[PDB]
Design a protein around this ligand. Structure first.
Ligand SMILES: [Mg+2]
Ligand SMILES: [Mg+2]
Lengths: 242, 239
């Protein structure tokens, strides 16, 4: 069981021929069933196409990612989510479906996921993707001004905009801005710094700062755990009343 | 190139009477099967495919395909030799990262993670062909100082922390714990003013505000320290 014509099945198609038509692009993705939202930018050579299911979009992406057409090699990638939110400070005992139910009060939720580790235990963060931007704006606003509780325990969740990161295409060398700082940084190739050299001293002092920052961050963790446990005891003590 | 650890697919929720040839028959259309392992007991197995492209289609085509009452779970197998590199110069590309770490062993993939605007987040991922190569890379960059650019900022290699943000924690699995059902007794709501919930949820908001205040101050402290270091080195370079 899946949801159809969601933003997660919407593909960005770049490096198109300049004379491309809506019918020409619909014939390209003919194999992958019917298409919905079809956008095409006359100049710049790019557009969007929404396929019925995410599995169909995943197949179309791999089968056409660098397929050459009219001399140019196409660029097929998943389009960025305009209504994605990150939810932290999740309760212990949470689920994807609990988030889908909770955030559905703000608008149509396309997908909600509880981020888990290699052992299946939640990491404390979650993702909530809405159908459209105003529903995500409503959730962001209401959850900051009010206290959104998902479970019996009265611990409000933290709802923030999603910081979208690309760990797939990343930063290719062709895309790096070749400015003065770039050429300065590239004068020296990757190497191990020699003990007693200027670079060695500098790098060891940098390592010291990176380690000092980790110790300072560990201290914040200690302060919040100590304060959290004081509040958790007070909450447990107050329940014995009224 | 062919049959890398990036082509290894994990399949969970396999039926009880699963055979090695039966598991191979599932992925018959995706060319010749590679290394196939099955833990008949715990109901899971692994299968390597010729290419990451074939593996991606197989994952897409089977991620929730039912097989004898069971809803199969097909995901890419966890990379045993994956490392996280941080403190990267914004001028280190995926290609430069690969060239740099290739001196430790053969590399399957090296990526520099970028933000919503394509700018280097200062972090990357290096997936090695072998676990001892990743161990060699981790040991040498921690013992010594590894520099990728002219600026002497050392790369901070750590073993990669793998997080799942596609499958997640579904209700069918979460509701197995009776404490999840006890917690779901109250539905998601907004803490109403003048209740036990409103009083204490305000205290959590203040504690969260303090956590924010502290974390922002730590990054400010680190910023002035990196600036002070940069300034103290310009004076020391002139001997
Ligand atoms: Mg290069
Ligand atoms: Mg799955």
């Amino acid at each position: 069981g899946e949801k159809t014509f969601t933003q997660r099945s919407r593909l960005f198609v770049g490096n198109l021929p300049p004379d491309i038509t809506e019918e020409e692009m619909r014939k390209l993705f003919e194999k992958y069933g019917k298409a919905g939202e079809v956008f095409i930018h006359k100049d710049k050579g790019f557009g969007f196409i929404r396929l019925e299911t995410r599995t169909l979009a995943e197949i179309a992406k791999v089968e056409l990612d660098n397929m050459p057409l009219r001399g140019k090699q196409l660029r097929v990638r998943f389009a960025c989510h305009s209504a994605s939110l990150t939810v932290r400070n999740l309760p212990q005992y949470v689920s994807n479906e609990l988030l889908e139910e909770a955030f559905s009060v703000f608008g149509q939720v396309e997908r909600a996921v509880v981020i888990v580790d290699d052992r299946g235990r939640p990491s404390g963060k979650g993702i909530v993707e809405f159908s459209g931007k105003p529903a995500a704006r409503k959730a962001l606003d209401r959850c900051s001004e009010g206290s959104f509780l998902l479970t019996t325990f009265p611990r409000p969740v933290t709802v923030e905009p999603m910081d979208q990161l690309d760990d797939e295409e990343g930063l290719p060398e062709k895309l790096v801005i070749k400015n003065q700082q770039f050429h300065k940084e590239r004068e020296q190739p990757p190497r191990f710094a020699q003990p007693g050299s200027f670079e060695y001293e500098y790098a060891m002092r940098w390592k010291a700062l990176i380690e000092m920052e980790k110790q300072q961050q560990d201290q914040v963790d200690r302060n919040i755990k100590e304060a959290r446990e004081k509040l958790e005891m007070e909450m447990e003590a107050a329940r014995h009343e009224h | 190139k062919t049959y890398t650890q990036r082509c290894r697919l994990f399949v969970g929720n396999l039926p009880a009477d699963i055979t090695e040839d039966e598991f191979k028959r599932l992925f018959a259309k995706y060319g010749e099967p590679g290394e196939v392992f099955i833990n008949k007991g715990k109901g899971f197995g692994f299968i390597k495919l010729e290419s990451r492209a074939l593996a991606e289609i197989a994952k897409a085509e089977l991620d929730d395909t039912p097989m004898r009452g069971r809803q199969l779970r097909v995901r890419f197998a966890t990379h045993a030799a994956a490392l996280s590199v941080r403190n990267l110069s914004p001028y280190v590309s995926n290609e430069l990262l690969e060239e740099a770490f290739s001196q430790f062993g053969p590399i399957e993939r090296a990526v520099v993670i970028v933000d919503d605007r394509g700018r280097s987040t200062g972090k990357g991922i290096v997936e090695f062909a072998s676990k001892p190569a990743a161990r060699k890379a981790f040991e040498r960059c921690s013992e010594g100082v590894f520099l990728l650019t002219t600026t002497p900022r050392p790369v901070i290699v750590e073993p990669l922390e793998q997080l799942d943000d596609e499958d997640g924690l579904p209700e069918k699995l979460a509701q197995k714990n009776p404490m999840y059902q006890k917690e779901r007794e109250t539905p998601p709501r907004f803490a109403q003013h003048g209740t036990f919930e409103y009083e204490y949820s305000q205290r959590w908001k203040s504690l969260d505000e303090m956590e924010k205040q502290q974390r922002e101050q730590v990054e400010k402290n680190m910023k002035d320290a990196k600036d002070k270091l940069e300034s103290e080195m310009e004076d020391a370079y002139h001997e």
